[PDB]
Design an enzyme around this catalytic site. Structure first.
Site, PDB file in Angstrom:
ATOM      1  N   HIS A   9      34.881  30.897  -2.881  1.00 21.45           N
ATOM      2  CA  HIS A   9      34.566  29.649  -2.439  1.00 21.45           C
ATOM      3  C   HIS A   9      35.268  28.327  -3.408  1.00 21.45           C
ATOM      4  O   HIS A   9      34.778  28.224  -4.412  1.00 21.45           O
ATOM      5  CB  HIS A   9      33.130  29.198  -2.435  1.00 21.45           C
ATOM      6  CG  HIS A   9      32.385  30.409  -1.651  1.00 21.45           C
ATOM      7  ND1 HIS A   9      32.343  31.571  -1.994  1.00 21.45           N
ATOM      8  CD2 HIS A   9      31.799  29.960  -0.494  1.00 21.45           C
ATOM      9  CE1 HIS A   9      31.782  32.065  -0.782  1.00 21.45           C
ATOM     10  NE2 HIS A   9      31.304  31.355  -0.098  1.00 21.45           N
ATOM     11  N   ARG A  51      37.638  30.123   0.969  1.00 23.59           N
ATOM     12  CA  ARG A  51      37.325  29.051   1.540  1.00 23.59           C
ATOM     13  C   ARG A  51      37.547  27.737   0.826  1.00 23.59           C
ATOM     14  O   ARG A  51      37.508  27.614  -0.407  1.00 23.59           O
ATOM     15  CB  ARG A  51      35.646  29.131   1.839  1.00 23.59           C
ATOM     16  CG  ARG A  51      35.423  28.044   2.696  1.00 23.59           C
ATOM     17  CD  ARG A  51      33.677  27.920   2.676  1.00 23.59           C
ATOM     18  NE  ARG A  51      33.015  27.264   1.803  1.00 23.59           N
ATOM     19  CZ  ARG A  51      32.042  27.004   1.740  1.00 23.59           C
ATOM     20  NH1 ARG A  51      31.077  27.305   2.737  1.00 23.59           N
ATOM     21  NH2 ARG A  51      31.156  26.751   0.790  1.00 23.59           N
ATOM     22  N   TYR A 110      29.375  18.466   2.480  1.00 22.58           N
ATOM     23  CA  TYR A 110      29.182  19.789   2.350  1.00 22.58           C
ATOM     24  C   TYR A 110      30.187  20.785   1.441  1.00 22.58           C
ATOM     25  O   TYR A 110      31.297  20.551   1.857  1.00 22.58           O
ATOM     26  CB  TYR A 110      29.118  20.573   3.709  1.00 22.58           C
ATOM     27  CG  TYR A 110      28.829  21.914   3.346  1.00 22.58           C
ATOM     28  CD1 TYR A 110      27.655  22.538   2.960  1.00 22.58           C
ATOM     29  CD2 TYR A 110      29.997  22.874   3.605  1.00 22.58           C
ATOM     30  CE1 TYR A 110      27.384  23.880   2.601  1.00 22.58           C
ATOM     31  CE2 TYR A 110      29.809  24.248   3.359  1.00 22.58           C
ATOM     32  CZ  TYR A 110      28.465  25.025   2.766  1.00 22.58           C
ATOM     33  OH  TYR A 110      28.524  26.213   2.389  1.00 22.58           O
ATOM     34  N   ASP A 139      34.780  25.773   6.316  1.00 21.99           N
ATOM     35  CA  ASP A 139      33.428  25.542   7.104  1.00 21.99           C
ATOM     36  C   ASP A 139      33.338  24.022   7.420  1.00 21.99           C
ATOM     37  O   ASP A 139      33.012  23.193   6.719  1.00 21.99           O
ATOM     38  CB  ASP A 139      32.408  25.803   5.979  1.00 21.99           C
ATOM     39  CG  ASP A 139      30.886  26.212   6.698  1.00 21.99           C
ATOM     40  OD1 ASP A 139      30.619  25.694   7.800  1.00 21.99           O
ATOM     41  OD2 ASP A 139      29.899  26.715   6.224  1.00 21.99           O
ATOM     42  N   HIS A 142      30.403  23.020   9.104  1.00 20.00           N
ATOM     43  CA  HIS A 142      29.170  22.993   8.933  1.00 20.00           C
ATOM     44  C   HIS A 142      28.526  21.945   9.819  1.00 20.00           C
ATOM     45  O   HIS A 142      27.569  21.174   9.347  1.00 20.00           O
ATOM     46  CB  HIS A 142      28.863  22.503   7.475  1.00 20.00           C
ATOM     47  CG  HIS A 142      27.851  23.174   6.483  1.00 20.00           C
ATOM     48  ND1 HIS A 142      26.472  22.602   6.441  1.00 20.00           N
ATOM     49  CD2 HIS A 142      27.543  24.419   6.029  1.00 20.00           C
ATOM     50  CE1 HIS A 142      25.677  23.400   5.907  1.00 20.00           C
ATOM     51  NE2 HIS A 142      26.404  24.446   5.788  1.00 20.00           N
ATOM     52  N   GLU A 193      34.700  27.488  10.729  1.00 24.83           N
ATOM     53  CA  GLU A 193      33.247  27.829  10.811  1.00 24.83           C
ATOM     54  C   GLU A 193      32.425  26.795  11.263  1.00 24.83           C
ATOM     55  O   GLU A 193      32.403  25.471  10.904  1.00 24.83           O
ATOM     56  CB  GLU A 193      32.846  28.527   9.643  1.00 24.83           C
ATOM     57  CG  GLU A 193      31.435  28.734   9.176  1.00 24.83           C
ATOM     58  CD  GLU A 193      30.969  29.298   8.005  1.00 24.83           C
ATOM     59  OE1 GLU A 193      32.142  29.804   7.274  1.00 24.83           O
ATOM     60  OE2 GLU A 193      29.957  29.462   7.622  1.00 24.83           O
ATOM     61  N   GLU A 242      25.583  31.956  11.263  1.00 27.34           N
ATOM     62  CA  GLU A 242      24.884  32.219   9.986  1.00 27.34           C
ATOM     63  C   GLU A 242      23.542  32.079  10.296  1.00 27.34           C
ATOM     64  O   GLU A 242      22.600  32.519   9.696  1.00 27.34           O
ATOM     65  CB  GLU A 242      25.359  31.639   8.875  1.00 27.34           C
ATOM     66  CG  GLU A 242      25.047  30.190   8.872  1.00 27.34           C
ATOM     67  CD  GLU A 242      25.761  29.252   7.736  1.00 27.34           C
ATOM     68  OE1 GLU A 242      27.367  29.604   7.562  1.00 27.34           O
ATOM     69  OE2 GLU A 242      25.349  28.530   7.243  1.00 27.34           O
ATOM     70  N   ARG A 260      28.957  35.445  12.629  1.00 34.68           N
ATOM     71  CA  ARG A 260      28.555  35.250  11.306  1.00 34.68           C
ATOM     72  C   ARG A 260      27.278  35.449  11.035  1.00 34.68           C
ATOM     73  O   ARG A 260      26.591  35.705   9.655  1.00 34.68           O
ATOM     74  CB  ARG A 260      28.531  33.854  10.711  1.00 34.68           C
ATOM     75  CG  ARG A 260      30.114  33.304  10.882  1.00 34.68           C
ATOM     76  CD  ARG A 260      30.684  32.977   9.610  1.00 34.68           C
ATOM     77  NE  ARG A 260      30.073  32.319   8.781  1.00 34.68           N
ATOM     78  CZ  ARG A 260      30.013  32.507   7.481  1.00 34.68           C
ATOM     79  NH1 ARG A 260      30.529  33.747   6.793  1.00 34.68           N
ATOM     80  NH2 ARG A 260      29.319  31.804   6.451  1.00 34.68           N
ATOM     81  N   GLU A 274      31.679  37.365   3.352  1.00 42.41           N
ATOM     82  CA  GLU A 274      31.305  36.252   2.263  1.00 42.41           C
ATOM     83  C   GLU A 274      30.711  36.560   1.160  1.00 42.41           C
ATOM     84  O   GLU A 274      29.802  37.381   1.040  1.00 42.41           O
ATOM     85  CB  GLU A 274      30.533  35.014   2.933  1.00 42.41           C
ATOM     86  CG  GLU A 274      30.333  33.915   2.003  1.00 42.41           C
ATOM     87  CD  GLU A 274      29.801  32.640   2.877  1.00 42.41           C
ATOM     88  OE1 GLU A 274      28.989  32.879   3.782  1.00 42.41           O
ATOM     89  OE2 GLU A 274      29.941  31.440   2.284  1.00 42.41           O
ATOM     90  N   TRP A 306      23.376  18.705   8.894  1.00 43.92           N
ATOM     91  CA  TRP A 306      23.685  18.973   7.597  1.00 43.92           C
ATOM     92  C   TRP A 306      24.505  20.169   7.360  1.00 43.92           C
ATOM     93  O   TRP A 306      24.251  21.258   8.229  1.00 43.92           O
ATOM     94  CB  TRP A 306      22.643  19.103   6.430  1.00 43.92           C
ATOM     95  CG  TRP A 306      23.002  19.411   4.981  1.00 43.92           C
ATOM     96  CD1 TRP A 306      23.763  18.704   4.072  1.00 43.92           C
ATOM     97  CD2 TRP A 306      23.229  20.697   4.461  1.00 43.92           C
ATOM     98  NE1 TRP A 306      24.105  19.206   3.221  1.00 43.92           N
ATOM     99  CE2 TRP A 306      23.983  20.708   3.241  1.00 43.92           C
ATOM    100  CE3 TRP A 306      22.647  21.888   4.755  1.00 43.92           C
ATOM    101  CZ2 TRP A 306      23.688  21.804   2.607  1.00 43.92           C
ATOM    102  CZ3 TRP A 306      22.816  23.144   3.968  1.00 43.92           C
ATOM    103  CH2 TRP A 306      23.366  22.859   3.139  1.00 43.92           C
TER     104      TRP A 306
HETATM  105 MG   LIG Z   1      28.616  28.063   6.667  1.00 39.36          MG
END
Ligand SMILES: [Mg+2]
Ligand SMILES: [Cl-]
Ligand SMILES: [Cl-]
Ligand SMILES: [Mg+2]
Ligand SMILES: [Mg+2]
Ligand SMILES: [Mg+2]
Lengths: 405, 405, 405, 405
Positions: free
Chosen positions: C125, C150, C162, C213, C215, C239, C265, C286, C342, C405
């Site tokens: 990340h 990422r 984010y 991402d 998000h 993502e 996720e 995910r 991840e 969020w």
């Molecule tokens: Mg995510």
């Protein structure tokens, strides 16, 4: 505690700069409510629908029963839906919510879930004969703190087009005692709008939201192309791209462009928008409290739209009175999927006739916190401005074919 | 005028005949609200969700902002939907509507459009080991003035089945400190239900509404057949025909029978029902205020259903407390597309712990006209009934395979 | 030979740098299993779901019967699906697979078909306030041997967004005893991400895999546009483009871009993804062992995805404990349609509390070859780190509207 | 601990009452595995596929890597799917699972999630020239404790039909060194089957499950009609109603009848059934371990079916060896959506050649608890029964047209 029955209702017609029709519902407790009933260019049909048919049925009813009266008028008319029908129903509905708030001692937004936001973002209207003129006006709106601005420019070689006139903070198209005739050319229009947006981004930058109203003048495949041509400039929306009586008409547009689409100022019920929404063909729904059956029904339209992340973008031209604007702002402050509110300024005479609590500052509005809608009508002042017949314009192609204005 | 901030909130757990979990929200003005948070067989997971996570976030908030708190909890949890999540959200939502009504000095139904009807039709629960036993009980319910009656009978040769027990006016399946194990046989069940309905019509006649709960035990093509076999007897609904996590599961049923279908007592959001509704696969939606995110969210489920003439049929078993029933009855009296309300009687101890204004007479209920929900909790009395662990039963096929209870 | 019965189970709660909840299942043979039960920001709801409800039902059961217990808990809860429910089920499932491997004397991957690959590719990340900062960090990850990275950068003019913080090898957003409030602006974000990817390709080159991402912060038509704008830079995936409770929400995205899409996720069962998969709306799924019902259920999600060439991309943030990571790596090494894993690094204190056999080298991980999951918990060490309440952040639009969020 | 490499493999061909082809895989640790490779009427094509092509590629491989070898053979063949291809792959897969269980010291069902049930319900085969003969045989099966019975009777006026012969507990259609020719008449058949089911219910009653195999002989609209005619008698299933290479072929059947449908004994991969399953066109999937790519692949077929409440109904005629039956029973005991298992008894000579741990009692079977599959082959005994060419029959219409047998 208070259980008010309707004892009388009346239609007030006035022309403080333009025609407005207002419904006033009085209860035996002395509490009254107001509802906008203005239908631009066909105003007296709604006044008659109310005075001759709806009002007699209101007398004696329990004012608390908002849903019951909505259904009674909607189903009970037998002939369902339509601009005259649904505007009359909206007027009653608005007036009953006004009464409900007064009885509760709360502003209407507090009855609709409370505030979802601190204020209501609006857009203003920049228009000019040339692109340069239009961008200059837009710079002024931007400086005044508008976060969002509609752009309309003249079509070179064409004497007129939608949204361009001598008026700056509004546009008053119902301007004659017979419909003004206009001439339309699609080819020239399709080439000018991208140049307008290019020039606008060059001067205004990329933070401001920029909107454009196509005003029903394209076929779907033409709208798809205009969308493709405007994507580089990231329009907030492209509005009323093609006539939408056939809700499949937006399919080709959505297939070919990612420009966000808005429609529905002329819709009068959820049935005009159900497929546009469920098929994900639009991003903003433009239906209003006054023309789509009041707060009760507009909340249902918004709820359906919410399932698909479609947001509200209520129409807000001058022909919606301050009574409608008050209701719209209570709706806007409370609806979860709010997008934007259109704001054309009314004439000072109009504001005088309809005193209200709502405010505008720094590109944002708020309905205020008075009980009910926070709007009234000065009947003595209204009586001094007599109705004056005025029609919306018409539009024809260069060969004379009737077209969409 | 009054602008109350949340100063404290707490979870009360009590077992007056069965477990109930209740949220109490107090404001700085002294006005408080109550919300049911009971999730049968998993009660303490919701109590913890509230006490340890949600409540800390409530403190200091504007109690008027119902929508804002709903969205804050729904979106803000990050992990969305689910029975524990949505029951906690419902409890907050109910409590805030309770507060809103108290502030307005109005019963909650007056905030939701007013009364759409004079009272709320309910159904009761006739059960018996044999068909004869079941029909005898149904005759008693009919005489007592119930307009609608659910029929459940034993399956010959099988020691147990859903809905049959020694209790008459209710059914309390969470009956043990570990899940009671049951054995299921589909073939025998499919042959008994049509005989039950035949016998019922012979004794009760054709005016009374007759309901049946399949309780998740059929495949779709089996449910299609049971529907075909029950059509002659005109059931009001056949409920929970097949597990519905896959919303396509009702397609084969709808293709093959015209028996009306109901589902959704275990749904916790509109997302569990959107396709069942839009594809016209059901006639009644059974989701409740307590399990599907409160009044705010249940109104949205009902509005979507309304577009397809689908009506509400809220679940109403004993594991929904009088706080939930109060909220349900305010919802029922005001929602336009009301179908029916389930009514299982609570134990006297439960009624004592939760004093309420709602009433039952002649097969109809009414939420009453007290401000807010019209319900309270006697905390001193509640404290004398300690939590007692109790699970819902499980069901297995004759070879031991885990099945649906 | 060994036929172990469950004799006890308990929930261990610990905070070695952040909160983790772990289930330990003991059998009468002395063999035990561990399962992660951590649900970030709602941790104690799962602990209660387990301690008060699930665990009592585990006692006495045949530990070999993994499927039976999965179905027993899934169906038997009655209220189906959901983040608290499915995380509790996952914990039991993981622990039972751990036990199965120990009994068999084999690492778990050997029970799931054996190794399909020699190691498990992960992504790290890179985050920074400016694009330059972000690209500099990415260069470091690339040098360290990460094959996939990422990228998240700040949005100019906005105090937060984010994925951007002072932490380098991870991101710990649950950072306060009440949810941190953030302010979001979509327009600024849509313009910054393409500039980030442009700069990244200029410095990193084209072999490295680059991920982003979104998000949950875009509407579908906005995500379609971001996709179009990122295609030139060949992202490995984009993502969580838009909230996915409505599985039709990805339709407009897929129609308009060929950028690969990842989601899930926050999914807790196959029912959250069935239509996204079958309609070919995504390229990577995910969902994780801990949040989507364990190894048993995650294998079924992967099998459905495989039919459409959709690959696994398990979420791997810090709030999934080393017990989850161990299970994930056994799943990853054996699943045929593996895409990527991840990998956020845990704090040293976390590693000390959860000793494990899995390893990382040269951008690749491996679950190790110890019997079972190859993970343990040091209960004495865990006892020294007490639970500390911490919430995930919330996000609002500039007008105050609750947002994602 | 043990890490076995394949050192040799061989095909054993034997004819103890009928032809069987078996794969034996030996590892360097001395542990071996067995897999059925029998493809009725085309046996030597699979033997060659294995001996000449697959086996050479097995040597030296890690026997633990079941998935890797499955994919290697499936993808690596280049020419994908098919009865010879997938039967060879199944044989390898079965043998590797056998080895895995032996290494783990566990029966195979313990590796597939453990037991989901206490035993495996089977059906037997009642056949007779007349309906009376058929019902008499069915009464005997019922008395013997079969819970489910397939009914096949002669078609009056026709010398032969599928499933009717002098054999009682099985049916051995591959009966000649050239394909036996049969003559078919659809009209007569459609009228006899409902009379058979009527007579069967009259004598057997309604608890027993009654099955019928249409054996590919109807068009879809004809199958729809037969379904309608059999609904009154509540068949457990109607099998192979129409040829299914076109997976849309079941659409008209499903539209017109609620009789449960089964298909797939001749399917060799999930791709033959994906649309039948996803479109909810069938209730039972009949694919087998031996013909549809082994345990690894059959589990994936079952998982897809599970999403739609479709259950397994593995084919179980005599041409599947005891090695296949052992694997099938391990699959059946562990798969969650088990429906039924077909059971035709093998000749005593067959049982002698393939000693096994599985048992039958009171209409139920169990795979036993020996490590691995619990089956062996006596090679010395097998060597005494030489291959004997035998073909499945063919079927023609009365005008001589080639038809479906
Ligand atoms: Mg995510
Ligand atoms: Cl009209
Ligand atoms: Cl949950
Ligand atoms: Mg417009
Ligand atoms: Mg029920
Ligand atoms: Mg067959």
């Amino acid at each position: 505690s208070m259980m008010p029955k309707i004892i009388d209702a009346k239609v007030i017609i006035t022309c403080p700069g333009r025609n407005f029709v207002t419904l006033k519902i009085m209860t035996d407790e002395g509490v009254y409510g107001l509802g906008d009933a203005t239908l631009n260019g066909r105003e007296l049909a709604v006044a008659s629908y109310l005075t001759d048919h709806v009002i007699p049925c209101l007398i004696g009813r329990d004012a608390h029963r908002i849903e019951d009266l909505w259904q009674y008028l909607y189903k009970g008319a037998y002939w369902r839906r339509g601009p005259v029908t649904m505007t009359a129903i909206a007027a009653v509905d608005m007036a009953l919510w006004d009464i409900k708030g007064k009885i509760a001692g709360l502003p209407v937004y507090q009855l609709l879930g409370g505030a979802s936001r601190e204020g209501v973002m609006v857009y203003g209207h920049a228009n000019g004969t040339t692109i340069e003129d239009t961008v200059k006006v837009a710079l002024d709106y931007q400086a005044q703190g508008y976060k969002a601005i509609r752009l309309q420019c003249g079509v070179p070689g064409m004497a007129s087009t939608y949204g361009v006139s001598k008026d700056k903070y509004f546009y008053e198209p119902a301007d004659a005692d017979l419909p003004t005739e206009n001439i339309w050319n699609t080819s020239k229009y399709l080439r000018i709008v991208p140049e307008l947006f290019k020039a606008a981004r060059e001067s205004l930058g990329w933070d401001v939201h920029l909107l454009h109203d196509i005003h029903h003048r394209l076929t779907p495949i033409e709208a798809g192309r205009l969308g493709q041509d405007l994507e580089p400039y990231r329009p907030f929306w492209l509005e009323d791209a093609t006539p939408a009586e056939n809700q499949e008409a937006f399919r080709l547009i959505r297939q070919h462009t990612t420009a966000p689409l808005a429609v529905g100022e002329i819709f009068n019920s959820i049935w005009d928008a159900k497929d546009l929404i469920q098929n994900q063909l639009i991003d903003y729904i433009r239906a209003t409290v006054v023309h789509a059956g009041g707060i009760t029904h507009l909340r249902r339209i918004a709820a359906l739209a919410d399932l698909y992340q479609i947001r509200t973008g209520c129409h807000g031209a001058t022909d919606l009175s301050p009574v409608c604007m008050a209701a719209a702002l209570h709706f806007d402050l409370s609806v979860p999927n709010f997008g934007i509110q259109e704001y054309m300024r009314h004439m000072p005479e109009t504001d005088a006739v309809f005193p209200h609590a709502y405010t505008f500052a720094d590109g944002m509005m708020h309905p205020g916190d008075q009980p009910g809608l926070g709007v009234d009508i000065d009947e003595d002042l209204a009586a001094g401005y007599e109705y004056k017949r005025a029609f919306l314009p018409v539009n024809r192609l260069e060969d004379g074919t009737m077209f969409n204005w």
